Every structure is written in structure tokens, then in C-alpha cells.
Amino acid sequence: FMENFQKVEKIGEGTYGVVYKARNKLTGEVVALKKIRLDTETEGVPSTAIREISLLKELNHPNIVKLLDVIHTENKLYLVFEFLHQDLKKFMDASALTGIPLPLIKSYLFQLLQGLAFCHSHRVLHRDLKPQNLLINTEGAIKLADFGLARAFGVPVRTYTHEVVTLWYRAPEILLGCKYYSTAVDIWSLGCIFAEMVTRRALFPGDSEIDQLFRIFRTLGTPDEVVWPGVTSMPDYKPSFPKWARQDFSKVVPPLDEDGRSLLSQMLHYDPNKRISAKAALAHPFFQDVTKPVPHLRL
Template sequence: MSLDNYHKLEKIGEGAHNPLLVATDVHPLTCAISSPFPSTLEKSLLKGTYGVVYKAKDINTGGIVALKKIRLEAEDEGVPSTSIREISLLKELSKDDNIVKLLDIVHSEAKLYLVFEFLDMDLKKYMDSLGEKDGLGPDMVKKFSYQLIKGIYFCHGHRILHRDLKPQNLLINKGGDLKIADFGLARAFGIPLRTYTHEVVTLWYRAPEVLLGSRHYSTAIDMWSVGCIVAEMATRQPLFPGDSEIDEIFRIFRVLGTPDEDVWPGVRSLPDYKPTFPQWSPINLGDVVKGLDADGMDLVAQTLVFDPAHRISAKRALRHPYFDTVNLAAA
């Protein structure tokens, strides 16, 4: 399909490399390549990691979609590797109900557009829209937590790490269902685990092994982020809102205690571990994370285990007693 099939409505946001647009889908979504986009840009909606996103309308069906615009650096360089990675991952993951669907790919001149289903709001904006005394409520926290972990389980089952989970990357549709978006940093992982870059995950949701410089990490980094997000949904406050890497590390240590070799075998050998770190004792997590029942607190505690090898997996988390009473119709 060509860009002529979409009419840009407004700019939703802008990422590190490109803007995000919202557009209207005009034809059944295929994969044609064609002429420039005839439209008038109104405003940006969201910020993503690798592109500008626009809201657009499908001229043929009247349906609303999201267009992620990728600028190609140079003709001889072609599509950026980060975009190719995201496209290939999204094609693989689009079958899951809790992952945002990639509907189409359009290549026009020096631009690449990824056409996604349009969702109304991200989790952060959703929480911010609630009154000061209002919260998501225990049923909604449980439902969103389940849908988040279910989507991550699907990713991990397809050997993919998301690596940038945060409330801004979790979208909520009109039916009150949560879907995981923005796979710009995602990586397929193999056995043995690869060496990865240090630049993963927004600071507040970053696992301690990443903060301490480990370049060998696994699905456990996503589960740490899940725990931080579940806690934030319950309290409406970020759990570890550090303003630098060292501040982030110390905020974690002040709550969970400073890890030693007994708690986390191998921690002293991590590149950024310092023997001079202050020695804090753990405090009761329930004093920090309020609004969860005993099962919910146990689930969060199992996601916030220092040793990645003992952190709960998405598969085990879905079977946790906390979800025995999950109501997927909660709204």
C-alpha cells in the first residue's frame, strides 16, 4: 500500500531519531510502495525510541492507525538496522493480543512508515488522568499486570527481550486492555546469551545487573521492569526514580539492601560494582509498595530479586496465586 492511502491527522510524538505520526488507513493493508503522503500535519502525539509517530486515518475504511516515520539516513545506507530489527520482531510478535499490531509497511522516497493499530493512551497518561485520590483499583492493577506479563511471556517464548519496558511503552485501548509497544531496543537472544550493550531500559525500570555494567543478561531484565511497573500501578509513584545511574543503584539498595555474594553470587565481579558502596540493610517492601494484597506483594518481591537466575520468569509469574482471581473484563 502507498502513503496515498493514509491521511495524516496529527503528530503524536517524536523519538530520538524520528517523529511519530497518526494517520488514517485508506485501503486494506498490504505492502505497496508509492507516492508522497498528501496531508497537513497538525501535531505530534507521542515520543518513541526510534521514530516520530503520527495519528492517521485510513481513507478507504475510515479507521484510525498510528504511523511511525523512520528517516533513512542516506540512500546508500538504506533502512536503519534498528528499524529492520523492530520490523522483523513486530512481524513475529503481532499475533499476540497484548502486543501492538504492525499492520503495514510503506516505503516512500527517503522515508519508511510502519503502520500500527492505534491505541488511545499509554499507561502513564492513563494513570496521570486519574484524580489525586483515585487509583487504578486492585482489579485493574491485577488485570494490567497479567496482560503485561502475558505479552512478555509471548516475547520471551519467541526468544525476544523487550529491554525498554516502562509505562510510556504500554498502550491502553478503548476496551481497557493493555498492549506492549515500542520494540526499538528489543533483541532476539540465543544460547549462550549474547553480550549486549549497556544502553537499555529507561533508568527507573533498569535491572541492577544492567546498572552494574553486566553485558550478559537475559529475560530477567524485563521481569525486573515488570516488578517496578506493577508497584507503580499500585502506588501511582515510581518505585526507584533515580536521577543518575548511581542514584538509581542506591535507591534500590536502600530498599532491598546492598547485595553481597551470598545474596547475589558474582555481584562483586560486575564491572561497575564498588567495594566502597554503602552497606544498607533491606527494609519491608510492603512499607514502600502499598495497595497490593499479600499475593501481589509476593509477586513483586519475586520480580525484584537481585540474582537474575532466581528472579521469577514470565511463565511462572502467570501461574502465581495473585492471578487466580484475575478479571480480564475489569474496566
């Protein structure tokens, strides 16, 4: 019975929903309740969208948030998830003056690659990975959450006429107007998050589509047909883009050893077709000495 649960506090704000911590007034059980408003007051959610969401209840992995229940009405979609206390953004901020320790960076990266390898094998993308979307617990786990699946599945989410989007983790093929996404978009985002854990600063904090593109280009070099065959045929490519030279990855994430820099370079490959897959990245030598430390969380 999903009304013995009462809202305790607002957890966060997604791109189309607000999330609450909800507590069972008799058992104490706590869940995360995501409420997504729709663009309609009467028409509800299409059955085909509910079909696709509901299948994810039975596709489970330790590094993906668990979807517990799907509830829909004439004007709202509610998704009930397992609750975790903290996220990677908050943990980064607490660790910012010192740095998340390397063994924990490596463990979190490995786990997130395991989660992506799973969803990608089931033909599901995340599409909007950001540190605030990665949930952590006292036991050393990290989990993919806040998947960007509402529009992909046809949920008629409310349109926000003045929406402010964070573009910092967006793959360059999206910014250049690619008509079809691939699983490689999530590897790019995760590479950006990897670099952010190491350097304690977002890698490409752009403030518009062109500023995001130009920040990538000023670091990795303006892409051309040599490094990204097909780039000049992307819908938003402009031959008039300024031509910046590529910076060495030794300058991009300096403290990182050559094993880590090599993996990062494969995660940030311009061509999505040659960007490393999550499954291949799990075999990279950077992970030879991976362990599972626990963070010190102050809850």
C-alpha cells in the same frame, strides 16, 4: 497503498522515533506510524535488520501491539502499527488521586505477563518497558508497545549526542554493566510498573545511573554475594558502594496484600537468574481471582 493515509497528529516521541496518528482519507482507518531517522542519508537499513523486524509481523499475541508493515528508505525506517487511543501513563495520571482499582491492576499485570511470556518464548526482549509504552483500550486490553529492538537488530538509528534517558525501570544488571541481557530485564521493569500502579508513584525515579542504582539499593538493600551471587564481578560493581539495609516489601508497596507483595518480591529479585519468569508468574496465587474489568476512559 500507504499514501492514502495522512498524518492527523503527533502521538508521541520514542527514543529514536516520532509516532503519528495517520488516517486513510477515504476509509477513515487509523494507524500509528513510527518514523525512525537513521545515522546515514544513503545507506538505508541492513537487510538482516529488516529480516528480524519483518518476522514479528507473523508473531502475534493479544497483549502485543500488532506490527502491520515495515517500510525502509535510504535514510529512514517506518513501522506501521495498530492504533490505540490511550496508554498506561496517561491512565495512571488520571487515576492518581484515587488509584487504579486493584482488579484492574491485577488484570493489566496478568495480561502484560502473558505478552512477555509470549515474546520471551520466541527469544525476543522488550528491554525498555515504561508505562507510556503500554497501550490500553476501552475493552480492558493492555498491550506491549515501543519495543527497544532497533539497536539489538542493527538498525543504524541516529545517535543523539545529548539524549536524556529515563532510567527508572532499568534492571540492576544493566546498570551494573552486564554484557548479556536476559529476559529477566523485562520482569524487573514490569515489577517496577506493578509497584507504581499500586502506590501511585514511580518506585525508583533515579536521575542518573548512580542515582538509579542508589535508589534501588536504599530500598532493596545494597546487593552482595549472599543475595546476588556474581554481583561483585559485574563490570561496574564497586566495593565502595554504600551499604544500605533492605526494607521490607510491606514498606515498599504497603497497601498491597501478601499475595501481591510476594509476587513483587520475586519480580524484583536482584539476581536475574532467580527472578521469576513471566510464565511462572502467571501461576502465582495473586492471580487466583483475576478478572477482566474495563477502565473508564475519557477519550
